[PDB]
Every structure is written in C-alpha cells, then in structure tokens.
Design a protein around this ligand. Structure first.
Ligand SMILES: NC(=O)C1=CN([C@@H]2O[C@H](COP(=O)(O)OP(=O)(O)OC[C@H]3O[C@@H](n4cnc5c(N)ncnc54)[C@H](OP(=O)(O)O)[C@@H]3O)[C@@H](O)[C@H]2O)C=CC1
Ligand SMILES: CCc1nc(N)nc(N)c1C#CCc1cc(OC)ccc1OC
Length: 225
C-alpha cells in the first residue's frame, strides 16, 4: 500500500554510482534534492522511511546518521530478524524483502509512513528492481572539459529499462508539493540517449532529476480463493 521508490544519482551512460565505498562526486545541490525529497511529505503527520544496505550506512558521515526526520532502516544478513528497533531513528533488518513486508503492515505502521525510499547501495538496488514502484534517478553527465570519475558500482540500466519507462513529465507532480526545483522540464540528447527531466549544473557536471515508473502489465492471473 505505501509506494516504494528507489532514489539514486547515477553518471551516464553506464549509470555509475560509487567507487571504493564512496560516491564519485560531491554535489551539494544533488544532496539537497535527495534530502528534501526523502524528508518532505504531503501529510505533515507522516514520515518517510529510508532503507539502505549496511555498506551505504557505514559510508554516511557519523555526524549525519541516522538521517534526520526519516525512519532509517539498515539491512545486513548478520542482523537478527525482519525489523528490530536498535536505537532512536534506527531499525535493523536481516532482509530487504521481509522489512518491506513489515513496513507495509498498517497495524505496525499506523498508516503514518508516506513513502518508503530505497537509498542504496549497488547490491540493494540490484534486488530492488522487482520491488520498487518508481525510481527517482538523478542523471549526471560530465560537462565537456570534465574528467569522467573512476567508478566500480553501477545501477542495472538493462533491468531498469525492461521494467520501467521514463515518466519525467510527471516528476514535478510526483515530488512532495513543497519542494521547489530550479530547472524547467528539458529533453536533451546526450551520447545518443534522450535525457529528460529538470536540469541543474554544479561544479563540472550537468544533471537532470528524472522519474521512472513501472510499465503497464498484462493481466495474466489474479489469485482467487
Ligand atoms: N550514487 C548514489 O545515489 C549512491 C551510491 N551508493 C554507493 O554504493 C556503494 C555501496 O554499494 P554496495 O557496496 O553494493 O553496498 P550496499 O550499500 O548495497 O550494502 C550491501 C550490504 O547490504 C547487506 N544486504 C544486501 N542485500 C541484503 C538483503 N536482501 N537483506 C539483508 N541484507 C542485505 C549485506 O550486508 P552484510 O555484509 O552486513 O551482510 C551487504 O554486504 C558505495 O560506493 C556507495 O557510495 C550508495 C547510495 C547512493
Ligand atoms: C548522494 C545523495 C543521494 N542522491 C540520490 N539521488 N540518491 C541517493 N540514494 C543518495 C544517497 C545517499 C546516502 C548518503 C547520505 C549522505 O550524507 C547525508 C552521505 C552518503 C550517502 O550515501 C553514499
């Protein structure tokens, strides 16, 4: 019942997202977007959840975690079970899939979660293509004089574009209504792919905020008792 949204920043065209356990760039406007999207809600009585893998959590600066004003969930196979409060703001789960089931329980959640955002890292996003309802992808491109950074972790773009379509016409309506974005919706070709979304530039990069949404599915079966 709650939407599940993966949110990630990726460098085109290979959709690289990390190198040596860290992000391959430091873009304050891209961090601000991620902060505002995952923190803000349309209903001020609700919060969103951020779910992340153990190596993502260990990479977030200590003074900045758990991420404020969001319920944080960290997943590790060494943890005890599907969704356990361990500290204020912090839940631990030994299962991405079972934590999503647990968070979706209206009895547990009192209908006070608005969205669940899956915020990384590579291993977790690999497993999320069949769990997410939408992806919010910041597509990053180096500007012509900018050196492409080294990267070692990538979003699965094949499986992205099998299952989801570029729905960026609807991004501004999908984001919580109090966010305010600088760009207007723009379509630009870049190395032969269409990049569509809300543009910004920072340091040596241009990047677009984009929305992908699941493709329509045929009706093959519905379970009957
Ligand atoms: N550009 C961006 O938007 C982002 C980039 N990143 C980048 O991604 C990289 C980190 O990715 P990665 O190394 O893949 O690691 P992850 O952050 O994906 O963490 C992987 C760990 O999560 C646990 N885990 C994985 N699947 C499950 C599951 N189904 N259930 C319970 N636990 C599970 C395991 O923990 P354990 O070993 O303890 O069992 C595993 O080692 C860094 O470079 C980081 O900067 C991260 C977030 C955002
Ligand atoms: C890097 C900011 C970001 N952007 C988008 N679009 N999606 C995301 N999932 C993230 C992220 C993240 C986690 C994070 C937070 C942080 O300081 C608050 C530092 C590092 C982070 O992840 C490696």
């Amino acid at each position: 019942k709650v939407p599940v949204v993966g949110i990630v920043a990726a460098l085109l065209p290979e959709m690289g997202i990390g190198f040596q356990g860290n992000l391959p760039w430091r873009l304050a406007k891209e961090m601000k977007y991620f902060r505002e999207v995952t923190t803000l809600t349309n209903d001020n009585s609700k919060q969103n959840v951020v779910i992340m893998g153990r190596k993502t959590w260990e990479s977030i600066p200590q003074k900045f975690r758990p991420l404020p004003k969001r319920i944080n969930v960290v997943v590790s196979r060494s943890f005890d079970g599907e969704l356990r409060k361990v500290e204020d703001g912090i839940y631990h789960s030994n299962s991405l899939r079972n934590c999503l089931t647990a968070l979706q329980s209206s009895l547990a959640n009192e209908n006070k979660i608005e969205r669940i955002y899956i915020i990384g890292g590579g291993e977790i996003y690999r497993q999320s293509m069949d769990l997410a309802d939408h992806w919010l992808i910041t597509k990053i491109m180096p500007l012509p004089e900018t050196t492409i950074p080294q990267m070692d972790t990538f979003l699965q773009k094949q499986e992205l574009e099998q299952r989801f379509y570029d729905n960026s016409d609807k991004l501004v309506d999908f984001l919580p209504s109090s966010i305010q974005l600088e760009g207007r919706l723009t379509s630009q070709e870049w190395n032969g792919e269409l990049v569509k979304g809300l543009p910004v530039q920072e340091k040596g990069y241009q990047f677009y905020f984009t929305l992908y949404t699941k493709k329509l599915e045929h009706h093959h079966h519905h379970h009957h008792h």
